[model samples]
Target: GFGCNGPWNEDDLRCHAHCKSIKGYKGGYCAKGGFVCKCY
Candidate 1:
């Protein structure tokens, strides 16, 4: 998706891939702290 750091994950609110940081919500299912996308 555009402006997205990586792919989306159905299991979690964050993306399946990795990203810089997500605004508002925190990163979930991601081990790198704020690298995951909270797309929910």
Candidate 2:
């Protein structure tokens, strides 16, 4: 599970793991509630 869990990073910015980082952009981070990501 090397690429399955852990902290966040620049590459994580393109992750579609959350809701906010899944709609507008491609990936990012938790925008507000640590769950609402700010994708790119």
Candidate 3:
């Protein structure tokens, strides 16, 4: 993913998939400061 606010450009779905693969994940999205792929 690109940004939580989002300028994703096509990365959003991949992020969605990335988090989706994990069993207990709430979701995936991007955020600044640390890096994208903030999963919880």
Candidate 4:
């Protein structure tokens, strides 16, 4: 739920880049409701 962005497609590069830009984040998952930029 944290670091969630606006609703986006699962393959949206924006989400990937958005998360990758974070300090300790890798990529993102464009899930329903929004984009989750936190990965395990």
Candidate 5:
């Protein structure tokens, strides 16, 4: 809801979360178990 609920960038390059804080990156909720920051 606020920040990333689970571990961030905790995976391989391909299967990893592409969430980033930069231009043209749309932030959203990542439901891995709960809502997390899916900014990309």
Candidate 6:
């Protein structure tokens, strides 16, 4: 599993490179703050 910082707004975020696989991908708000995108 892997993750990266992302915008709170989905419109400002996108997945690329090794994150192309949508499987296990999770998008939501970060615990600390803002948004996050995760790929597994």
Top of the candidates by lDDT? 3
Ranking by lDDT: 3, 4, 5, 2, 1, 6
Write one digit per residue (lDDT tens) for candidate 4, span 1-40: 4445565334456666767778788776666565554442
lDDT of 5 by residue, 1-40 (tens): 4444446533322222344444565544554753354554
Query: TM-score per candidate, in order?
Result: 0.20, 0.27, 0.54, 0.49, 0.29, 0.25
Instruction: Write candidate 2's Cα lDDT for 5-30 as tens digits.
Output: 34443333334454343456554554
Candidates 2 and 3: which is better by TM-score?
3
On a 0 to 1 TM-score scale, where does candidate 2 land against the true structure?
0.27
Clashes of each: 1, 2, 0, 0, 0, 0
lDDT of 6: 0.37
Q: Which scores higher on TM-score, 5 or 6?
A: 5
Clashes of 4: 0
Could you tell me the C-alpha RMSD of candidate 4 in Å? 4.5
lDDT of 1 by residue, 1-40 (tens): 2123433423333343333255553444533333443443
Off by over 4 Å in 6: 1-8, 16-18, 21-34
Error of 3 at 35 (Å): 4.2
How high is the CA lDDT of each candidate model?
0.37, 0.40, 0.60, 0.59, 0.44, 0.37
Writing each residue's lDDT as its tens digit, candidate 6 over 1-40 gives 1233443344223433335555454443232322444333
Ranking by TM-score: 3, 4, 5, 2, 6, 1
Q: What is the lDDT of residue 33 in candidate 4?
A: 62
Of 2 and 4, which scores higher on TM-score?
Answer: 4
